[PDB]
Write a protein that binds this ligand. Structure first.
Ligand SMILES: O=C1CCNC(=O)N1
Ligand SMILES: O=C1CCNC(=O)N1
Lengths: 196, 196
C-alpha cells in the first residue's frame, strides 16, 4: 500500500482547507489512516510535507513544458499544453489554490523552488520558443510573457472558480463548459501567436 | 473621507497580515488614528469593513469596463483596458492579493457582490462585446472567456509577483519591464481577437 501517497493527498486537502499554520499533523494522519509517528517516518516536519505537496503540483503542471523539444510543431504543442493545464485545473483545483495561497503570502516556504529549478526550466524553454520566433513558426512575442499567460489563464478557472461560477453559472466539472473553456483559451492564445 | 480612507487603507494592511478572523477592529483603529467607536460610525462591523475593502479594489478594476460603449472602437478599447489593469497590478498589488485570497476560500463574504452587481455588469458588457463579434469588428470569441483572460493575465503580475521576479528578475515597478509586459499581453490578446 501507498501510505506516502495517502499522506500527500490527505495533506493537500487539509492544507487547502486550513492553511499552513492552521493545519495540525494529527489531522492529516487521521485522514490518511496512519499515526502521527508513522507520518513522521515519511516527512520529518509539517514544513517538509508542505513543500512536498507543492512540489507534486509543480511536477504535474510542468510535465508538458518539460516535454517541449526544438523539432515539435509549435502551435500544436502549445494547444496541447493549454488543454493539459485546464485538465489539471479541473482535476486538482485544491492544489492549484494551495499553490496560489503560497504565492499570495510571498512564497515564504517555496521561494527556493522558484529561483532554482523553475527559473532554469523557463530559461531553457524560453530559448526554445524564441528559436521558433526567429524561424517564423510563431509571431514575434516574448516567450516568458506567453508562458505566464498560459499559466494565468488556465489556473484562473480553479483559483477564481467562485467568480467564474457567479458570472457563467458553471464550473470545469461541467463537460460542455470545460470544452468551451479549452476552445476559447486556445483560440485567443493560438491566434495571438500564429504567424501572419 | 480622509478618515474613511485611512480606515480602509489600515484595514487592507491588517487584513492582509492577519486574515479576516485574526484581525481585531482595535488594531485597525490604532493604525488609522481613530477610536474604535469612530471606526464603527463608518463601518458597523468587521465584516462590512472587509467587504468595503474588497469593493474598493472592484471599483478600481471595473472602471474601464464600465466605460465601454457600443460606439467605441473595440480593439483600441480592449488595448486600453489591458494597460489600465496592469497599472492597477503595479499600484494596488496588496489589494489584488487580498481579493484573490477571498476567492481561494470560496468567497464566503464576497459572494453577494459577485452574484449581484458583478454578474449584472458582465452580462451587460458581454452583450456589447458579442455585438462587436456579430458586426465582424472582432474575431469569433466568447466574450466571458475574453474578459476572464484579461483579468487573469493582468492580475497574475501582482498575485504571482514573487514567481515573476524569480523567473525574470523584475517587477512592475521596473519601468522597462512594465512596458514590455503591457506590450506583450496586448499583442497576444489583441492579435488573438483581431478580425481576419
Ligand atoms: O504551471 C505553472 C508552473 C508553476 N507556476 C505556475 O503558476 N504555473
Ligand atoms: O478585473 C476584475 C474585476 C472583477 N474581478 C476580478 O477578478 N478582476
Amino acid at each position: 500500500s501507498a501510505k506516502k501517497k495517502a499522506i500527500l493527498s490527505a495533506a493537500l486537502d487539509t492544507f487547502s482547507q486550513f492553511g499552513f499554520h492552521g493545519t495540525r499533523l494529527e489531522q492529516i494522519a487521521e485522514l490518511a489512516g496512519v499515526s502521527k509517528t508513522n507520518l513522521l517516518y515519511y516527512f520529518p516536519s509539517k514544513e517538509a510535507l508542505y513543500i512536498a505537496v507543492l512540489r507534486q503540483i509543480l511536477d504535474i503542471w510542468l510535465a508538458p513544458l518539460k516535454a517541449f523539444r526544438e523539432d515539435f510543431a509549435p502551435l500544436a504543442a502549445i494547444k496541447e499544453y493549454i488543454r493539459l493545464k485546464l485538465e489539471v485545473s479541473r482535476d486538482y483545483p485544491q492544489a492549484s489554490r494551495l499553490f496560489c495561497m503560497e504565492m499570495l503570502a510571498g512564497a515564504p516556504l517555496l521561494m527556493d523552488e522558484l529561483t532554482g529549478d523553475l527559473k532554469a526550466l523557463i530559461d531553457e524553454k524560453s530559448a526554445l520558443i524564441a528559436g521558433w520566433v526567429k524561424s517564423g513558426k510563431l509571431a514575434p512575442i516574448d516567450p516568458q510573457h506567453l508562458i505566464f499567460m498560459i499559466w494565468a489563464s488556465t489556473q484562473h478557472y480553479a483559483d477564481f472558480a467562485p467568480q467564474v461560477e457567479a458570472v457563467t453559472g458553471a464550473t470545469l466539472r461541467d463537460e460542455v463548459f470545460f470544452n468551451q473553456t479549452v476552445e476559447n483559451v486556445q483560440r485567443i492564445i493560438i491566434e495571438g501567436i500564429r504567424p501572419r
